[PDB]
Ligand binder design. Structure first.
Ligand SMILES: *[C@@H](O)[C@H](C[C@@H]1CCNC1=O)NC(=O)[C@H](CC(C)C)NC(=O)OCC(C)(C)Oc1ccc(F)cc1
Lengths: 300, 298
């Protein structure tokens, strides 16, 4: 198994650059609106505790330089929605895909199109950690790069990049501008919650192992969801939700292994360790493949 | 540190579907030519010992169905170049990027756009193994998916997918239709030569781990180039050349760790192991990042 990103072309066709003064970051051009992080209006002096509302009142449409490549897009309105700026432009993007804005849950994966100056540089798969950070590869100038999933013709945008935390992990918002996690767009001291292991994804991984014939860890027992959750927390695993149980449905049906029976197998692995054994050729349990990722690869 | 693929849009706009009889795979549509694996012209009974020139002379332009989305492209000509079929169509692709065809060297990396029925499905980074296989993720119908690198505006196509081996690794050709490795496009179980580990890439990745503040594997020892290479060969690592040392200069400068010092750290890891420890998340030494890959992402 490997991290596989979605093809990025439908998102590449939406990337632009947005500049205020000397600050350039990326924006997302859909129909006649460009979405970008509101901290584009900050000077270095405003970043420690910006008054975004006061900073925005000082701005006019003609202060925003929006470019697709070297071609300027004229701004005809502006507004702030939580931590994102929305710039109305006079041209509808002809490459606008079918799209929606979604707010994902921890554990869910998405593709990131890393961009600098409106130009895409790379694409890679990210997992939203339970502490609402991602382990991106984001340099200066990457803000406004987005994360997405593609289903049929439809791009679901779920992430827009805003900042790096002291530990090197990354934080951002959904496309309505609401941060994931307890972070704020100020250049202040912020730390992530201690991270935990994404249980639903480990279970997906165990299902993948079973599909591929590697099933030594299956046992004759079961558990309740509550009993499993109380044990899992003692090993720094996330508790399962009802939604987690539901999204394991398809893999449970494909293997005939009830979700709670797999939980009992995982509980035994946590309590007894691997005893020098491997699963899918690894003594480490993987937690960045979702149930959908596993189906995406195993079955095509 | 993240494996990062090139943005795939310039290649997505070239993918089409090619069908012959009951066989469907992907093709690459550049200007007015579609490139695809020639085994699309095979049936079940053909796959075992296909005399491709014989099978092809018995085909007409009209036996080839090419679809770009919902639109059928009329084939007005065909030819074979090694293991690739070239179908001339009456329409030019306006989305054809600036491109070239290159043959890559073992140890080099590229992005794969995996496709099914002419539709892009996923993108990921691969390395050409020293034994000329690739560790891909390819399923039924993935043939004709391509691998590529992008430099500025220019797409360098280096790989077209043809087959899976019994071990689960993959084999294919350059865009001139010559296989990488000793493989043949017949429906037989084929083994590769013994694989080895790409040493210059492991060193690049260790330098990456250091840059990201991870240096538990470092040491004060050093080694000569020849003595390192003796140990490498013993562990089925590829030789490290002076060109490789030179190529690693920038990473050496940035971290202030001489290449041969990092060679001494790798030698220790080979002889002793990781003793449970991990490097950049991995229990294993990673060898599919090139020096250029590490830099580009730093
Ligand atoms: C694309 O047409 C397809 C891609 C394969 C399918 C699954 N994963 C892939 O990468 N190519 C082939 O199926 C290829 C066609 C030949 C004409 C070159 N053959 C192939 O990949 O065979 C797979 C294999 C596992 C080797 O199956 C076996 C065939 C014969 C045997 F004796 C034993 C196994």
């Amino acid at each position: 198994f490997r991290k596989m990103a979605f093809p990025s072309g439908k998102v590449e066709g939406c990337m632009v650059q947005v500049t205020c003064g000397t600050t350039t970051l990326n924006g997302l051009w859909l129909d006649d609106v460009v979405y970008c992080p509101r901290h584009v209006i900050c000077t270095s002096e405003d970043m420690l505790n910006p008054n975004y509302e006061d900073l925005l009142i000082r701005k006019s449409n003609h202060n925003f330089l929006v470019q697709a490549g070297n071609v300027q897009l004229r701004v005809i309105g502006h507004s702030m929605q939580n931590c994102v700026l929305k710039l109305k432009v006079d041209t509808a993007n002809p490459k606008t895909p079918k799209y929606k804005f979604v707010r994902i849950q921890p554990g869910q994966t998405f593709s990131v199109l890393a961009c600098y100056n409106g130009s895409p540089s790379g694409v890679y798969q990210c997992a939203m950690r339970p502490n609402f950070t991602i382990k991106g590869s984001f340099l200066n100038g990457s803000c406004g790069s987005v994360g997405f999933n593609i289903d049929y013709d439809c791009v679901s945008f779920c992430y827009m990049h805003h900042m790096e935390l002291p530990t090197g992990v990354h934080a951002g918002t959904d496309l309505e501008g609401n941060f994931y996690g307890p972070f704020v767009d100020r250049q202040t001291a912020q730390a992530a919650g201690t991270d935990t292991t994404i249980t639903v994804n480990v279970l997906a991984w165990l299902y993948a192992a079973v599909i591929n014939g590697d099933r030594w860890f299956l046992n004759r027992f079961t558990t309740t969801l509550n009993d499993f959750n109380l044990v899992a927390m003692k090993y720094n695993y996330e508790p399962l939700t009802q939604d987690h149980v539901d999204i394991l449905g398809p893999l449970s049906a494909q293997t005939g292994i009830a979700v709670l029976d797999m939980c009992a197998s995982l509980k035994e692995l946590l309590q007894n360790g691997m005893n020098g054994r491997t699963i899918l050729g690894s003594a480490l349990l993987e937690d960045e493949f979702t149930p959908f990722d596993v189906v995406r690869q195993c079955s095509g």
